[PDB]
Structure formats: structure tokens, C-alpha cells
Amino acid sequence: TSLDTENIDEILNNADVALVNFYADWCRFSQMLHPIFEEASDVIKEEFNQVVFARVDCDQHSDIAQRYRISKYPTLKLFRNGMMMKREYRGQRSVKALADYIRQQKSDPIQEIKRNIIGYFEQKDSDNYRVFERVANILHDDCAFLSAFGDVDNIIYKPPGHSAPDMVYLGAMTNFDVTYNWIQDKCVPLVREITFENGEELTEEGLPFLILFHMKEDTESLEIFQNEVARQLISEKGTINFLHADCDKFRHPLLHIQKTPADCPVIAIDSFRHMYVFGDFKDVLIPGKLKQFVFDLHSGKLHREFSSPPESSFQKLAPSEYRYTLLR
């Protein structure tokens, strides 16, 4: 199934789930993938519109590629109801990995009766549930979703364990954008955790990183970074990614700025060209500082002098030229 201008909108808008291979002919990795994609589609006909496999020749349909923000070849996009998923298939390039992935994506995800959302419904055969299902289908990796039917409609967000109060959804449950955004807000915290599992996605968001490195149990530090970012940098959340990392797991980034977990908590920026150190941690409390730190990245002030700064460490988490042709 080769998408084009004429047929794309139909196929995708109606597909419950669509895996789309945006490729190019001259791409070594793409050419490697073609027959793997081919076999997995054959295997995924253990279904029966439910799940469609499709491809885009990004050289034939430049208009299509530019609109799905294809940053490299081959890109594997997931679509649900013709909406593109933010997460890409970033796993092993084998028929099994692929078919498993899709199986995973088509699965559960909600259990009918850590952070927890739960939905209350008259009927699974109703608009609201459809909307809930669709959300849980997107967000199952960030949250755990549950469904209670019958007597024995509403959405409740149950946060981190006891001594933390339930939060009730007040929006329209037939309204998918709002329901989506409410749940998404409760799931995806202002300062997100960076791991190797998710690192690559985070890089492809195209923002420099502002990171707190800290000692896993040290949460005094996370919390104070948490609301300093909130209190000082909200105005700048579209310019920079607020993140936190565990020192032991990221000793290598710490090597770049001549630090060890001993020195943690440490606040740094990784711009994808260089890494920059904030200074004393407790300096976060000084009113201007954190913000100025961010400001200075953007003004070029950090670069300057200080004779050239150390390289990005997090660029290695970004998609590899040993796995993809990379587009600029």
C-alpha cells in the first residue's frame, strides 16, 4: 500500500491503527527494512481496516514527508484514527520485533475492574468510553488506565501513593481534545525523567535539555528543581526541555562536565553541541539564576568564552547514523 497525495487521507483517517514506513530508495537502511516491513504485514493478517501497513516514498511525496516531520529514513510512524502518534517505533529492525510491537499496540490496554487513571461508565457501548479508550490507547506508557462498568460517568486521576488526594475530571467526556489534554497533564509531569529507554524520543523533540542529575533517593533536590522550573521557566517551555536524570545511570554525561555522582545534584544544559554547568545547586533558590542560565544558552552568552566548551553527551542518545539516514 503506497500512499500518495490522492489516497493518503482516506486510508489513514479510518485506520484504527496504521504503521507507516516513510522511506527513500537511496537509503541503505530503508532498503534493508523493505522486506522486513513486508513480512510483518503478512504476519499481522491474523487480524482480518483494523491494522494497515503502508509506505511513503518521501522522494516522490515531499509534501507528505514535510507534513509528518520526517527527520530521517526509514521512519516508522504509528497512526490511530488518522492521528499521528508522537512516539515512533524505535526498536529492533526484525519481523518479530515489529509484529510484537503492533500486537502490543493493538492490545488491552485498559483493565476492567505508579500513577492511575480510572474511568466510570454506564456502557462500554457509549461515546465517553470510545473517547477514554482512544486516550488510554495513546498514553498507556505514561499511565495505568482502568475501567469500571455498570453499577457495582466519570474520570478520576489517582496520583503517586497514599497521602495524595484524588483529582476529578470536569471536562466534556465526549470531547476528545480536552479529555486527552487533561489526562496528559496528569501523566506527563513538567520535569520528565530521562532514561535510555526514552532518551532518543526526547532528543527528537528538538529542544536543548536542562537537566538535574541526582541520586535517585535524593528527592529533596528533585522537588526544589521541580517548582523552581515551574516558578521561573514556564515562559520558556517551548525553548527548552526540563528533565531530570539519575547520576549512576548517567555517569557518562557527567564525565563530560568533569563531574561524578559525588557532586550530585548537578544542574546542566546539554544543547546537543556542548554541555554547560549551572554552578552550586543551592544557587537555584537565587531569584534570577535558573532563568538567566536558560537565557544565556539562547543568547550565546554561555559560549563565551569560557576555550571551547565540552561536547554534548546527549547527542549520542539521538538517532544514529549507523541506523538511519539523517535529514537536516
Curated annotation (Swiss-Prot):
Record's note on what induces expression: Up-regulated by inducers of the unfolded protein response (UPR), including tunicamycin and dithiothreitol.
Spans annotated as Interaction with ITPR1: 182-231
Pfam family, any one: Thioredoxin
Record's compositionally biased regions (Polar residues): 307-314
InterPro entries given in the database record: ERP44, ERp44_PDI_b, Thioredoxin-like_sf, Thioredoxin_domain
Gene3D superfamilies: Glutaredoxin (3.40.30.10)
A GO CC annotation given for this chain: endoplasmic reticulum lumen
Keywords: Chaperone, Disulfide bond, Endoplasmic reticulum, Signal, Stress response
Thioredoxin domain span: 1-104
Main subcellular localisation: endoplasmic reticulum
Superkingdom classification of source: Eukaryota
Single GO MF descriptor: protein disulfide isomerase activity
Disulfide bridge positions per record: 143-187, 247-264
GO BP terms, alphabetized: cell redox homeostasis; glycoprotein metabolic process; protein folding; response to endoplasmic reticulum stress; response to unfolded protein
Subunit structure as annotated in this protein's UniProt entry: Forms mixed disulfides with both ERO1A and ERO1B and cargo folding intermediates; the interactions with ERO1A and ERO1B result in their retention in the endoplasmic reticulum. Directly interacts with ITPR1 in a pH-, redox state- and calcium-dependent manner, but not with ITPR2 or ITPR3. The strength of this interaction inversely correlates with calcium concentration.
Function, in words: Mediates thiol-dependent retention in the early secretory pathway, forming mixed disulfides with substrate proteins through its conserved CRFS motif. Inhibits the calcium channel activity of ITPR1. May have a role in the control of oxidative protein folding in the endoplasmic reticulum. Required to retain ERO1A and ERO1B in the endoplasmic reticulum.
Protein name: Endoplasmic reticulum resident protein 44
